[PDB]
Amino acid sequence: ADLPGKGITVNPVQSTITEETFQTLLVSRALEKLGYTVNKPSEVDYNVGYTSLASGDATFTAVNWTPLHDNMYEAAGGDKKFYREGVFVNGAAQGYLIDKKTADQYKITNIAQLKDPKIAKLFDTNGDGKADLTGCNPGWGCEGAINHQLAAYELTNTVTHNQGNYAAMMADTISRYKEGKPVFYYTWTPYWVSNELKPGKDVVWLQVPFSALPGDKNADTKLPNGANYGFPVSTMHIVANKAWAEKNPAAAKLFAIMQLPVADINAQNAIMHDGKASEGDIQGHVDGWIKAHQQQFDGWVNEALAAQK
Ligand SMILES: C[N+]1(C)CCC[C@H]1C(=O)O
């Protein structure tokens, strides 16, 4: 009769990106149905998350990105210290965008065109002549990807990687876009930005001149027709402490089979951004998703409970 997680405490970890909370708590709810006591997530830098997971201070994360986290994953112990099975979120996109108005006028389709200082000046916001790319916070996996690519594409003389607080910077970028000025930024899905600036209407994605990712000399981000946006279709995974997973087969199975559509996280993140972003609202987003997918959610729980436990 007794549920397998009775008496066992779970510590989730995510980053300080509040938009990660929904998917983290979805896993927490599932573990609670398996009987576990789940604490509120710790919100720490990704790299701190991975070392905590490897030591056993943290139990799971649900925001492990491939390939952007590969270097942090391997560095912290890789498959020797971590359990990682299945695919939690498929079909994420990332890349570089400029406003469609500017792209159409000057016929800009490739980031390599920003080597021309005249083109780059269009996107200068601080007057130093260089294009100002709204980029990634220190510690994000995309920090390393963007730095690597600007160097590889010979863009460091005309393009600046602006770093700080991405969410605040993007509000300024949207404000500038609304004044009718050119903008240049990196983003990903799922996140709230793509709801405000939509490709084909407001903005366009830029291609890159060849494949370049840090730590993999033979990376190939090309699509079958030869078009390249600089990043592959990306996925998120649930990652757990390996030793904990070996002792908790019901949880291990649950982690391998849970799946959340990228569109659902996009929708939740958009609602948060329109003002409903308190802890209490996010809990209700999670509870409402479950009620709307009750058969699926219960199926995951039933499969986990039927593991050899
Ligand atoms: C901030 N991010 C959510 C953007 C894509 C993956 C991740 C990161 O760069 O690590």
From Swiss-Prot:
GO terms for cellular component: ATP-binding cassette (ABC) transporter complex; periplasmic space. Transmembrane segments: none annotated. Coiled coil: none annotated. GO terms for biological process: amino acid transport. Disulfide bonds join C136-C142. Substrate binds at W65, H69, W140, G141, C142. The keyword ATP-binding does not apply. It is found in: Periplasm. Keywords: Amino-acid transport, Disulfide bond, Periplasm, Signal, Transport. InterPro entries: ABC_Gly_betaine_transp_sub-bd. GO terms for molecular function: transmembrane transporter activity. It holds the Pfam family OpuAC. Gene3D superfamilies: Glycine betaine-binding periplasmic protein, domain 2, Periplasmic binding protein-like II. The complex is composed of two ATP-binding proteins (ProV), two transmembrane proteins (ProW) and a solute-binding protein (ProX). Part of the ProU ABC transporter complex involved in glycine betaine and proline betaine uptake. Binds glycine betaine and proline betaine with high affinity. This is Glycine betaine/proline betaine-binding periplasmic protein. The gene is proX.
